[model samples]
Target: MKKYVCTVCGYEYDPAEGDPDNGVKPGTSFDDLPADWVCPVCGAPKSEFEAA
Candidate 1:
């Protein structure tokens, strides 16, 4: 699985089987992010996302 980090807060968003907070239900992929999804901790843009 891929790990995504928030540029602002350095928060890691790990792809797991189920994460209800981000709507990343079981088997969610990193590329499945909705167009309107923003960082939960800092509201950063998708462009700020990075591999961790």
Candidate 2:
């Protein structure tokens, strides 16, 4: 799965090591994250992210 970056804060989200605190497990694609998921560091929405 391709990693994505929070454009607002530069927080990179990697599918290989999804956000455990946010309930995103390993292998979960960035596109498959919950609709309400936000960047952990900056609270930016998914739309604010881009491919890293």
Candidate 3:
């Protein structure tokens, strides 16, 4: 698994510890996330994320 970083606010998406606060399960990959997902820290869309 890999991590992704939000270009706007540096929110790191960890596959091993997904954004539970946002209903994302652990081990969820960035590519597996919903299209409407956003950066929990800054509200940036998935388009603003990149491989970390």
Candidate 4:
């Protein structure tokens, strides 16, 4: 799986280590994230992320 980075805050999202603070478990892919998921650091929408 590819890594996704928050364009607004530079939060790198690794699928191998999901955002547990936000209830995302490991193995969760960028495509598996909820539609309303936002960057934990900057609250930027998923649309603000891109392949890292």
Candidate 5:
């Protein structure tokens, strides 16, 4: 799985270690995240993320 990084806060989202703080389970890919998912660090929208 690929990793995603938040452009606003530089938070790296690792599929192998999903964002549990946001209810994202491990193994969940970036594409599988909810449409409203935001950066847990800066609260940026998903559109603010890119391949890491």
Candidate 6:
């Protein structure tokens, strides 16, 4: 399991789950984020996410 950190809001998405907002939904993968998907919190680009 990989970790993704949001750059704009400093939100962390963990594989363990339970986080209300940043958590990746079941059956969803980080790659699922479309090229146009932006940070839900700040509208930042996917480039904003880094391996954490």
lDDT of the candidates, in the order given: 0.74, 0.81, 0.81, 0.83, 0.81, 0.68
Instruction: Encode model 2's per-residue lDDT on 1-52: one tens digit a residue.
Output: 6778887877787778788877788767777888888888978888898877
TM-score for every candidate vs. truth? 0.72, 0.81, 0.80, 0.82, 0.81, 0.62
Better of 3 and 5 by TM-score: 5
Candidate 2 ranges with C-alpha deviation above 4 Å: none
| TM-score of model number 1 | 0.72
Candidate 5: the clashing residue pairs are none
- Please provide, for model 3 over 1-52, each residue's C-alpha lDDT reduced to its tens digit, 9 standing for 90 to 100: 6677889877677867778999999868777888888789978787888888
* Residue 21 Cα positional deviation in candidate 1, in Å, after optimal superposition: 1.8
lDDT of 2 at 38: 85
Residue 19 lDDT, candidate 2, scale 0-100: 84
From the highest TM-score down, the ranking of the candidates is 4, 2, 5, 3, 1, 6
TM-score, prediction 5 = 0.81
* Candidate 4 clash pair list: none
lDDT of candidate 1 over 11-40, digit per residue (tens): 877657545776667676668766777787
Model 5: lowest-lDDT 10 consecutive positions: 8-17
For each of the candidates, the C-alpha root-mean-square deviation to the true structure, in angstroms, is 1.8, 1.2, 1.3, 1.1, 1.2, 3.4
What TM-score would candidate 6 get against the native?
A: 0.62
Model 2's number of clashes is: 0
Q: Which number leads on lDDT?
A: 4
For candidate 6, give the lDDT.
0.68
